[PDB]
RNA sequence: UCCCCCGUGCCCAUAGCGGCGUGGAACCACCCGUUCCCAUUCCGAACACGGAAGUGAAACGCGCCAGCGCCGAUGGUACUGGGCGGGCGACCGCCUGGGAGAGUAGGUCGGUGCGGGGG
RNA sequence: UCGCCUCCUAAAAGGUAACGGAGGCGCCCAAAGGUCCCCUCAGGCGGGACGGAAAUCCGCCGGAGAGCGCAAGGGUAGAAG
RNA sequence: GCUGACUGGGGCCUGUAGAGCACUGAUAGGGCUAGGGGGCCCACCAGCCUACCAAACCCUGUCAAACUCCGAAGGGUCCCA
């Protein structure tokens, strides 16, 4: 994924969008840059990077450094992107959030109710070069009670997390039906 | 209907609607959301009668999670009496939505039954709305 | 140390039908005592006050033990 | 001249170290206080006091107790900001012993009952804490003087830690136990 | 934490700040709002008898004795965990009418 | 007031006043109290009625 | 001057809580006693006194760690002195100064005067 | 409804209206006052004779959520308790 | 007889806007879990299950004129111009 960048001196950040870029940041232990991405051409990236994955971006300097979003604010109302915080990797262990894939149709379903994934990722802490894709979940077996959570996954090589972790991931709930008005 | 079960106060001035959200702007827990497009004081009555329209729609099926809360207090006075004589009696209750607000949103239904469902319920509402589906809304790492 | 009120102190005698016993330093002479005549810490004790008067010799193990029921 | 004492720093003292024990004089499992609230049986003071489980619980563990008093609002328990409904005693060192082990081998007993001292009981610190059905019968009678079935709840902390060294100081120190 | 610290009942300048050590007894003559130890005189860190009220009410008039030298001759008590009891070490001079 | 009811107190010595108030019922029936005169000062103090 | 400890103040969590070190030579504490001054709503627990066998266990002092706590950017918003506009209205926009709160990167298990005893 | 007190409305000094929003006062205490000396809470979790889910106990953990005669607010354990 | 409005520079006094839940309350769902319908029940010694009710507590989302861990712009005042 890769995604260009340019400096920015000090000039009113509302032009750059009145115009058509996306200002922003980079930054981590060591350096921290005003810079700035095409609005309609980091979107695009965006939508399948996210923060799963790495943006690799670039800059004058033909320098392509990988980092990945540490927080895009939005606008409120017109809900588009106003300003992205970009973590610039290194070889230190890093906190981040790894996708979770659940596969499988949960017994739950067939029976009766729906799959709320209460979590689709989790803070884990890894290592820039070792960093996974998606931690696989086994939702089959699940019924309508409750349901398997953060103490439960396949936690891949070098890969341990930063969460209780009971913190629930997943739960089936059951479905809703007709029969309403309770206070008669 | 919809209402806080406990209060310290039982009226409360009316206050204004200027600004965007405050919060509650990113779909947080469903796959789809209805988002708001203009201020309001969203009635108890208006949320039953869009969440009973998706309940409805998509008859036995998913899991709709209402995100706006009507706890503030609508007062009006006895019909045909004049100003004054202390302030009215509690009519029902609201939400305070601003623009950007996700008011409402589905869960484990198909594309095409979370449209036609958040769009029926746009319509039980007294503001334009826009609907939409998890994107940028991965507000973390 | 407190002036007053407090008791007395005093050594006196902790009889016992069994032996004798702890060594003065309470404040009673005369007592019914019974250290344990027992214990009671695991065994030694239970001495379950419901021994059937005189057992056995009457009713024991006879009438014919389980016999040839195998046949 | 002390009945236990000897039991205490001439037995146990070792059995515990080498068995758990090493190294100082002092990380031994002992004991340091001995105190016992009562609360007034099945029915409280009255302004008409009580006073008697004062005097006479006072000498049957050689001195004197105190008087605490209830406090907050009661409502349905007949209370009030409180004043009295305690008198309980403290104590160690001397009396601690004297009390219980010229009690603990020889009044405890005689109670028409059962097993021994409930086990699951200690904590943490080791500091246990029985209470007889108060039932102030025996030791140290001496009838007359008899009003109320008033007896007691006795509070035991010692030093030590866990269970194990606490129950240990106890159980090889004279504490029939377990059902 | 037994608190107390009373001291803070200070104002007026000057104070015999005591310590009831189980060996010794300190005493320091402390000022104040300029942070600074005046005078001083320790138990048998400074060497004198062997007896506990007895060292004290002595390794009092020491300090008394230094005190004066230096013109200081009003002061205020103290002793945080003091007691006023015992080791109360009194002495001649130190305009204190403590 | 009704039951506290206001007095003065007399210098015992001769005259003089201060008045206060008691509280006939609460704890209380006949007021003894150190105040300083005017007339000399320096006694004790009766209640009275005025 | 330089390390350690004992009292004292200032700064008032980056100054703590909790784990894990460790320290007694000295000081300090725990202890040994409680006849004596003095004590407890009852207990020499706490105050208090006279000591000196044993100890660092406790408490405390001094280090180690980031997990809780705490501190916390840079950017970008919000909001807003002042100025100028739009909408029937609910409200909203541009210019010029000021500019958060949260969040993120990250920071921290203190700093520091005066007087004592000791190498 | 009419005087007094607390909070808000009141737009971060003070002040600020309406038949605006929500509660109190018309006492009391000889100790609930002065000073000196000690003491520190509420709850949470254990363990507890009668023991509710708070009687009084014991052990940790707990900076204040307890308490302060009565409304509300401010204040407060380095005490006003 | 230069002290005025207004203004520049200092020093603080403050809790609105905004925001945020640490307090007081209000909150949807989920987890965990005292109870209570009740459920297999070996029957008192616990017990097991529960797309119902459901505490306290944690997680995700929020709400406030009489909430505030926090907090502007400004405003007030004094000094020098
Ligand atoms: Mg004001
Ligand atoms: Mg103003
Ligand atoms: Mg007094
Ligand atoms: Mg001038
Ligand atoms: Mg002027
Ligand atoms: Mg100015
Ligand atoms: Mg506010
Ligand atoms: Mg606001
Ligand atoms: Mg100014």
């Known amino acids: 994924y890769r995604l260009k960048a340019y400096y920015r001196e000090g000039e009113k950040p509302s032009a750059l969008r009145r115009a058509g870029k996306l200002p922003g940041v980079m930054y981590n232990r060591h350096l921290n840059r005003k810079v700035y991405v095409d609005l309609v051409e980091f979107d695009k990236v965006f939508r399948q990077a996210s923060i799963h994955h790495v943006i690799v971006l670039e800059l004058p300097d033909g320098q392509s450094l990988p980092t990945l979003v540490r927080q895009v604010n939005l606008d409120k109302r017109r809900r588009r992107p106003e300003h992205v915080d970009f973590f610039v990797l290194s070889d230190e262990p890093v906190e981040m959030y790894v996708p979770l894939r659940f596969v499988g149709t949960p017994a739950g379903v067939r029976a009766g109710g729906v799959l709320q994934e209460i979590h689709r990722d989790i803070l884990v802490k890894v290592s820039p070069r070792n960093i996974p894709e998606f931690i696989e979940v086994d939702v089959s077996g699940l019924e309508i009670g409750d349901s398997l959570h953060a103490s439960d996954l396949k936690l891949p090589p070098g890969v341990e997390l930063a969460v209780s972790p009971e913190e629930t991931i997943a739960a089936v709930v059951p479905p809703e039906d007709v029969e309403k008005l309770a206070e008669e | 209907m919809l209402m806080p079960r406990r209060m310290k106060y039982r009226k409360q001035q009316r206050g204004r609607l200027k600004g965007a959200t405050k919060g509650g702007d990113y779909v947080a827990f469903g796959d789809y959301g209805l988002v708001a497009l203009e201020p309001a004081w969203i009635t108890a009555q208006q949320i039953e009668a869009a969440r009973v329209a998706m309940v409805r729609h998509f008859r036995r099926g998913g899991k709709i999670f209402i995100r706006i809360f009507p706890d503030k207090p609508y007062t009006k006075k006895p019909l045909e009496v004049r100003m004054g004589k202390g302030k009215g009696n509690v009519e029902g209750y609201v939400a305070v939505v601003k623009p950007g607000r996700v008011m409402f949103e589905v869960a484990g239904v198909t594309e095409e039954q979370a449209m036609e469902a958040l769009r029926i319920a746009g319509h039980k509402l007294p503001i334009k709305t826009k609907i939409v589906r998890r994107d940028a809304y991965d507000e973390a790492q | ?71 | 001249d002390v009945a236990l004492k000897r039991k205490y720093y001439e037995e146990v003292r070792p059995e515990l170290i080498r068995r758990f024990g090493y190294q100082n004089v002092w990380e031994v499992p002992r004991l340091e206080k001995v105190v016992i609230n009562q609360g007034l049986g099945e029915a409280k003071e009255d302004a008409r006091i009580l006073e008697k489980a004062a005097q006479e619980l006072a000498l049957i563990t050689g001195q004197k107790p105190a008087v605490t008093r209830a406090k907050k609002s009661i409502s349905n328990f007949k209370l009030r900001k409180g004043m009295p409904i305690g008198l309980r005693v403290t104590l160690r060192r001397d009396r601690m012993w004297i009390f219980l082990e010229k009690l603990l081998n020889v009044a405890l007993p005689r109670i028409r009952d059962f097993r021994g001292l409930n086990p699951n009981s200690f904590d943490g610190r080791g500091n246990y804490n029985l209470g007889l059905r108060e039932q102030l019968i025996f030791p140290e009678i001496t009838y007359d003087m008899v009003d109320a079935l008033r007896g007691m709840d006795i509070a035991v902390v010692t030093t030590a830690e866990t269970d194990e060294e606490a129950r240990a100081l106890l159980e090889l120190l004279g504490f029939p136990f377990r059902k | 934490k037994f608190r107390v610290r009373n001291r803070i009942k200070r104002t007026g300048r000057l104070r015999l700040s005591v310590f009831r050590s189980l060996k010794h007894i300190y005493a320091q003559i402390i000022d104040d709002e300029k942070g600074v130890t005046l005078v001083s005189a320790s138990s048998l860190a400074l060497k004198l008898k062997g007896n506990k009220t007895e060292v004290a009410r002595q390794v009092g008039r020491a300090l008394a004795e230094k005190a004066l030298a230096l013109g200081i001759k009003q002061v205020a008590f103290d002793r945080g965990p003091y007691k006023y009891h015992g080791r109360v070490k009194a002495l001649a001079e130190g305009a204190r009418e403590g | 007031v009704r039951i506290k009811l206001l007095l003065e107190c007399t210098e015992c010595k001769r005259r003089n006043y201060a008045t206060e108030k008691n509280k006939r019922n609460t704890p209380n029936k006949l007021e003894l109290r150190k105040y300083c005169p005017w007339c000399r000062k320096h006694t004790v103090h009766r209640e009275v009625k005025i």
């Open chain 3, 1 to 71: 140390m407190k002036e007053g009120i407090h008791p007395k102190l005093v050594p006196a005698r902790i009889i016992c039908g069994c032996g004798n016993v702890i060594e003065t330093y309470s404040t009673k002479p005369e007592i019914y005592v019974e250290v344990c005549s027992k214990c009671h810490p695991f065994y030694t004790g239970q001495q379950r006050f419901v021994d059937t008067e005189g057992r056995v010799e009457r009713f024991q193990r006879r009438y014919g033990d389980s016999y040839r029921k195998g046949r």
